[PDB]
Amino acid sequence: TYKYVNLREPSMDMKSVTDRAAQTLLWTELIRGLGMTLSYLFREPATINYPFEKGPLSPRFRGEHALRRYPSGEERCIACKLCEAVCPAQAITIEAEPRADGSRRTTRYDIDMTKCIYCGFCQEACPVDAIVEGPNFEFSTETHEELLYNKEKLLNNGDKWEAEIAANIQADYLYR
Amino acid sequence: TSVKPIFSRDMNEAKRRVRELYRAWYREVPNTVHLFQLDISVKQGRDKVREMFKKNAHITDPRVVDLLVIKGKMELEETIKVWKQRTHVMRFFHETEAPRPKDFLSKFYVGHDP
Amino acid sequence: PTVKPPTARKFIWTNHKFNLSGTPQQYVPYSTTRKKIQEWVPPSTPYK
Amino acid sequence: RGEYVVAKLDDLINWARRSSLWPMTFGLACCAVEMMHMAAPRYDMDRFGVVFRASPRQSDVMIVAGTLTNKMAPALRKVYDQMPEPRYVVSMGSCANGGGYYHYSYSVVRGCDRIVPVDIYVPGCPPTAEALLYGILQLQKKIKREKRLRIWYRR
Amino acid sequence: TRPTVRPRNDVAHKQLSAFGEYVAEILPKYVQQVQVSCFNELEICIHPDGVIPVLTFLRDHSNAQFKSLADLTAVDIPTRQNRFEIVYNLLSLRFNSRIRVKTYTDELTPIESSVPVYKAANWYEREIWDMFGVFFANHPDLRRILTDYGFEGHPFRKDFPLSGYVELRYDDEVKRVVAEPVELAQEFRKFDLNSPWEAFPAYRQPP
Amino acid sequence: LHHAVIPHGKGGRSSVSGIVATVFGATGFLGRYVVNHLGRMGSQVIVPHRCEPYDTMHLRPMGDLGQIIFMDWNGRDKDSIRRAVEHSSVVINLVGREWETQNFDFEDVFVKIPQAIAQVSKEAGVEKFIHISHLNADIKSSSKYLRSKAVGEKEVRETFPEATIIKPAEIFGREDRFLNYFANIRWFGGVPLISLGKKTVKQPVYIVDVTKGIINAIKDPDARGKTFAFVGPSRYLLFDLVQYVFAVAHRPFLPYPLPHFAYRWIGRLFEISPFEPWTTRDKVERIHTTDKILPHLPGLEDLGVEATPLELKAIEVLRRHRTYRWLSSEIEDVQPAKTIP
Amino acid sequence: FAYDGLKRQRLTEPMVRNEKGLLTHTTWEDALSRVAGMLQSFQGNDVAAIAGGLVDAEALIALKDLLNRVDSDTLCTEEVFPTAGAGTDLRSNYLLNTTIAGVEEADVVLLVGTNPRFEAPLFNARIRKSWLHNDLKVALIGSPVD
Amino acid sequence: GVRTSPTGEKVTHTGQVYDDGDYRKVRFVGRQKEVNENFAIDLIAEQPVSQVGSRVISCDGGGGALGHPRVYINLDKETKTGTCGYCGLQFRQQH
Ligand SMILES: CCCCCCCCCCCCCCCCCC(=O)OC[C@H](COP(=O)(O)OCCN)OC(=O)CCCCCCCCCCCCCCCCC
Ligand SMILES: NC(=O)C1=CN([C@@H]2O[C@H](COP(=O)(O)OP(=O)(O)OC[C@H]3O[C@@H](n4cnc5c(N)ncnc54)[C@H](OP(=O)(O)O)[C@@H]3O)[C@@H](O)[C@H]2O)C=CC1
Ligand code: SF4
Ligand code: SF4
Ligand code: SF4
Ligand SMILES: [Zn+2]
């Protein structure tokens, strides 16, 4: 089915022809348009008072990256390199070797935050919930180099944001 | 060895097209130096034009020559209509590039590239 | 968090920190791996 | 005391400059949509004194909002150069920050800081409108820290 | 009745097969191959000499009426002596059908411009010339459309490197943007992903 | 060589040149060209700056990520100097003013500061030290600028005996205070010259030539403990040179003699400016000082640099001084000035 | 498994003896100049060379030509071969003429003064393959190694 | 634990630290070197060994689907503990 958006024949009776004459000379349809912007003047605006008020987000939000630990404090990351393989932007760089004990752990874990597209494939790919995108979106920097995160920066992010991150995973993991 | 031609049936027709393009470029250099306000001289512009024609002087395939002339004409139309900017016109001169050595010993010291 | 407090971990920061960009305590990137090739060290005595 | 006077005069000019930032009407790709959302009613950048103006002659900030190609690079440099001073650049999003997801492309400039100096780098693909607004406020605090007249005084 | 498997439509397959040979019967001078895919798309493989006759017939014939050129593009297959495959995707509103017409060429052989048949082809052919280097004869205005001015090479060729040969930066000494040989602070990491076990026996090639 | 400073790559932006240079006075006319050239090939550059960070923004695009490092410093504090040089292999000193201020004078910037940088650099084990003096440095010179250059040049030589000292003539370039200085005299109508500028000979040198000479001195092992004189290829009478400047800028040229005492009196008048003086008495003396001939010293050719003639680059500097009517004039319209064999 | 020896004890810079008889890093230009200066002052028997076990043919021929241009013929290897009789005149005198794959066609193998297990492990595996699948007879003159 | 190199630079949990004469440490002058102080190798070693009464035990890291893939560990050797290859928790057989 279709409909016509603009296929009208206007009435030619005297009343309709005078109603259009008054509209042309008295600008009635232009005054009607003033009424609508007047009605907005007296509405409450939609502005929020940033940074005192914040735009609503959900637990799924994809923000700054972090590397997480188990409750014991051991790193979750096992240097499987699945996040590095799936990264659409090739933003992750990883090196690994046996730790001083026998553990399989990374020696390099970099994210070029200026290559990253914040797509979240890395946290989907991770089998142990080690790499996540956190809820933080207020980390703009004065230099480019400050956005090339090494493993120390990402572990600090996890230690900094774990309290919020764990609660967000708790809200969403049954959808995953 | 029977193939579909582009513009020239043989190398003598192709060289006629090459000479014509050289004239158009030769006439244009004085205008290009003026419009784009280049700090090179007209001789430098014409020397560069000559240099670009001589790097291809060994072609013997009229279809290859036809394409180089085709590309050379698009290159010229970009310049005349000022679709190019000063940066594009000056890319032919590689001003910021340091001279790479050509002798063996100089290559040997810097690195491994042949 | 008053009604639903977060889960306490030993490794979680006790003191939150704001954005430190542009300050002496900003983040500076570096390579976290060790040297990969060891260079030979010549003997410290003469013998030639 | 000259020290006290120049200190106060920096506050005056710094306050004027950060309170009346006029970004160039300049956007390149996806990230320009989030910039439009920062002008929209919810965030209303204009309420901070941040007003878009089209002419580079009447602009204080270039927000590089999107991918910079090699074909567009001379044009971006041209309009930056035509800004009167003082002028600032905000790099918005992964593309402008360091090439992003077209980083290895033959036609893409790997970061707009190869072409212009950059004051603030806003991460994201795209940064949320609020993330950009955070970046603008970070630029305001940077301007608030400028010591032009104090440095002039001690020259 | 198989929730995960895409259903077949054998009616559309039958109809497209009949039309495919109908085109082969009318244009035998040019048509080299006709095939219909398992998801019901009809492809006509023609000699490049027949681009104008074949496209004109499909547009104008009363049983064709492919009045719309949806897409025109090229594929580069270096292992073929005619490495470039030119692909025309046409749509017929009258019969609610689509058809694909394909031909071939190399780096030195020109293909006739189809702007006389479809004015939509003007920019599609400039893009093919720009990204592949295929020359279209009698084009009203053939020049680069996507690459930077003065750009050298045809990036969509398989042997053109992903990051190209030159990169740009602003140089303060000359006060302009300059082009210089490309160096990457991090080289793109080539991945070898293909599994060494065959996945689809139906497409196995004779040894 | 420590493994981190072995050269790698092809001498481009992302390469590793192996040079860790601390450049003092990088935010000036010469500094921006030195930093640019060092950055082009992938050098690590430390830029200690006194100015406000907005004024270093033009340096940031000159290096790959992490290659340009900025520090704060004060010429009178040696802790700040030592922090900026203790990781470097070469220290370059480009510090200088063309005028004195209430806080720093010619002795301070041309003797005390260079000596302190050389002194701290030596204590920190810096191996290469490049110091920019002046061709016309002389203790018998009228100008305190040139007298201070002679003292500082001597001082640096004892403090850092392996220093490479470079003595340029006036440097012409886009941001120079030489060709631009002459062109901006048009705002006063005629061009005053002491004795009409007929008793002065200049040998100006191109900025890029000087920059390449400094870069080549870093790499060349012969440059240690040497003194170079960087001069242009041709010598000109000051009258012809100023006349040439106005010919290239297409501005009316109305020279007229002005005696030294009267023109020294104009210099002090302009010295009242609390900002950057348009001209000073010292500048008036330096402009009219004939450029010395020092055959015993090595020059640009000893560093593999071909001095660029003034005639090939004046339009690069002077085009912006033309009115709209004459903006498009090409490099071939103006006849070269008379030289001196 | 020996590739990790490529990561350690590596020569990465030219080195010459300083003024106290100790090796110190220098540039290629200085290092080659000293050698070239000494090369130009000697001839004939005064110049010799020894090629080790991991040298490539390109280096071997380049070094032979260089010493030849000062009329030196003393190009030696560390590994001895008897030069009596034909010596190295005939390739067949110093080659594995049957080829490695030829072991699989042999019916009797005589090993003389060789522990092929450790001297050529993949050659010993070919012998065992024949010993196993072809009933090959192997005899040894030498130490009764395993 | 976070040692400090004789220069004073902190050593990371990967053992990284610029040596003396490495120019690259200039990048930390007037700034700081980012080092995570919670070394995972130390923290995991503070977990007590768990006594179990069977030859084989399973570990999923705790928290169900929030942990790691479930693996089964053999505890037959009495000269050592059984370690989880994912999370490093240790198990021993109770006699
Ligand atoms: C007894 C004897 C007495 C004799 C005298 C009796 C005569 C009385 C009646 C005479 C007619 C009165 C109106 C005359 C005013 C002009 C009217 C007019 O011309 O408007 C029509 C004009 C044309 O537009 P259009 O319809 O596209 O074209 C018509 C066909 N070509 O369209 C327009 O002009 C539209 C203008 C567009 C811009 C409008 C933006 C502002 C709109 C809000 C303004 C509100 C007015 C407030 C006035 C403030 C007063 C201080
Ligand atoms: N014609 C020429 O240009 C010639 C120049 N030279 C010498 O070359 C060197 C550079 O020339 P040029 O680049 O023109 O000099 P500029 O005046 O252009 O730049 C001077 C540099 O020195 C710094 N500087 C000046 N005074 C001080 C100070 N008191 N404390 C700290 N830093 C200071 C400035 O930093 P800020 O911007 O922070 O003040 C600036 O970076 C100078 O030594 C000059 O004498 C020699 C011969 C001719
Ligand atoms: S969010 Fe996407 S682009 Fe960013 S690191 Fe993860 S996988 Fe890579
Ligand atoms: S972060 Fe996760 S996916 Fe990436 S290497 Fe570590 S365990 Fe594997
Ligand atoms: S950074 Fe992301 S959102 Fe912004 S232009 Fe690039 S791809 Fe689009
Ligand atoms: Zn576990």
Curated annotation (Swiss-Prot), chain B:
A Pfam family matched in the record: Complex1_LYR_2
Principal location class: mitochondrion
GO terms for cellular component: mitochondrial inner membrane; mitochondrion; respiratory chain complex I
Keywords for this protein: Acetylation, Electron transport, Membrane, Mitochondrion, Mitochondrion inner membrane, Respiratory chain, Transport
Localization, UniProt: Mitochondrion inner membrane
Role summary: Accessory subunit of the mitochondrial membrane respiratory chain NADH dehydrogenase (Complex I), that is believed to be not involved in catalysis. Required for proper complex I assembly. Complex I functions in the transfer of electrons from NADH to the respiratory chain. The immediate electron acceptor for the enzyme is believed to be ubiquinone.
Subunit structure comment from the entry: Mammalian complex I is composed of 45 different subunits.
Keyword Acetylation in record: yes
Membrane topology: Peripheral membrane protein
Name this protein carries in UniProt: NADH dehydrogenase [ubiquinone] 1 alpha subcomplex subunit 6
InterPro entries tied to this protein: Complex1_LYR_NDUFA6_LYRM6, NADH_Ub_cplx-1_asu_su-6
Recorded superkingdom: Eukaryota
UniProt family annotation: Belongs to the complex I LYR family.
Entry's Gene Ontology BP terms: mitochondrial respiratory chain complex I assembly
Swiss-Prot record, chain C:
Compartments, record wording: Mitochondrion inner membrane
Family: Belongs to the complex I NDUFA12 subunit family.
Function: Accessory subunit of the mitochondrial membrane respiratory chain NADH dehydrogenase (Complex I), that is believed not to be involved in catalysis. Complex I functions in the transfer of electrons from NADH to the respiratory chain. The immediate electron acceptor for the enzyme is believed to be ubiquinone.
Description of how the protein assembles with itself and partners: Complex I is composed of 45 different subunits.
Protein name: NADH dehydrogenase [ubiquinone] 1 alpha subcomplex subunit 12
Phylogenetic classification of the source organism: Eukaryota, Metazoa, Chordata, Craniata, Vertebrata
Record gene name: NDUFA12
Residues of the full protein shown: 98 to 145 of 145
Swiss-Prot record, chain E:
Subcellular localization(s) per the UniProt record: Mitochondrion inner membrane
Translocase keyword on record: yes
Disulfide bonding pattern of the chain: none
GO BP annotations, alphabetical order: mitochondrial electron transport, NADH to ubiquinone; mitochondrial respiratory chain complex I assembly; reactive oxygen species metabolic process
A molecular-function term among this protein's GO annotations: NADH dehydrogenase activity
EC id: 7.1.1.2
Main location: mitochondrion
Entry keywords, A to Z: Electron transport, Membrane, Mitochondrion, Mitochondrion inner membrane, NAD, Oxidoreductase, Respiratory chain, Transit peptide, Translocase, Transport, Ubiquinone
Lipid bilayer topology: Peripheral membrane protein
Gene Ontology cellular component annotations, sorted alphabetically: mitochondrial inner membrane; mitochondrial membrane; respiratory chain complex I
Top-level taxon: Eukaryota
Catalysis performed (reactions): a ubiquinone + NADH + 5 H(+)(in) = a ubiquinol + NAD(+) + 4 H(+)(out)
Stated family: Belongs to the complex I 30 kDa subunit family.
Subunit structure: Core subunit of respiratory chain NADH dehydrogenase (Complex I) which is composed of 45 different subunits. Interacts with NDUFAF3. Interacts with RAB5IF. Found in subcomplexes containing subunits NDUFS2, MT-ND1 and NDUFA13.
Purpose: Core subunit of the mitochondrial membrane respiratory chain NADH dehydrogenase (Complex I) which catalyzes electron transfer from NADH through the respiratory chain, using ubiquinone as an electron acceptor. Essential for the catalytic activity and assembly of complex I.
Name used for this protein in its record: NADH dehydrogenase [ubiquinone] iron-sulfur protein 3, mitochondrial
Lineage start: Eukaryota, Metazoa, Chordata, Craniata, Vertebrata
Protein's gene: NDUFS3
Swiss-Prot record, chain G:
Localization: Mitochondrion inner membrane
Coiled-coil residues: none
Segments traversing the membrane: none
Functional summary from the UniProt entry: Core subunit of the mitochondrial membrane respiratory chain NADH dehydrogenase (Complex I) which catalyzes electron transfer from NADH through the respiratory chain, using ubiquinone as an electron acceptor. Essential for catalysing the entry and efficient transfer of electrons within complex I. Plays a key role in the assembly and stability of complex I and participates in the association of complex I with ubiquinol-cytochrome reductase complex (Complex III) to form supercomplexes.
Family per similarity comment: Belongs to the complex I 75 kDa subunit family.
Subunit structure and binding partners: Core subunit of respiratory chain NADH dehydrogenase (Complex I) which is composed of 45 different subunits. This is the largest subunit of complex I and it is a component of the iron-sulfur (IP) fragment of the enzyme. Complex I associates with ubiquinol-cytochrome reductase complex (Complex III) to form supercomplexes. Interacts with MDM2 and AKAP1.
Protein's recorded name: NADH-ubiquinone oxidoreductase 75 kDa subunit, mitochondrial
Residues of the full protein shown: 292 to 437 of 727
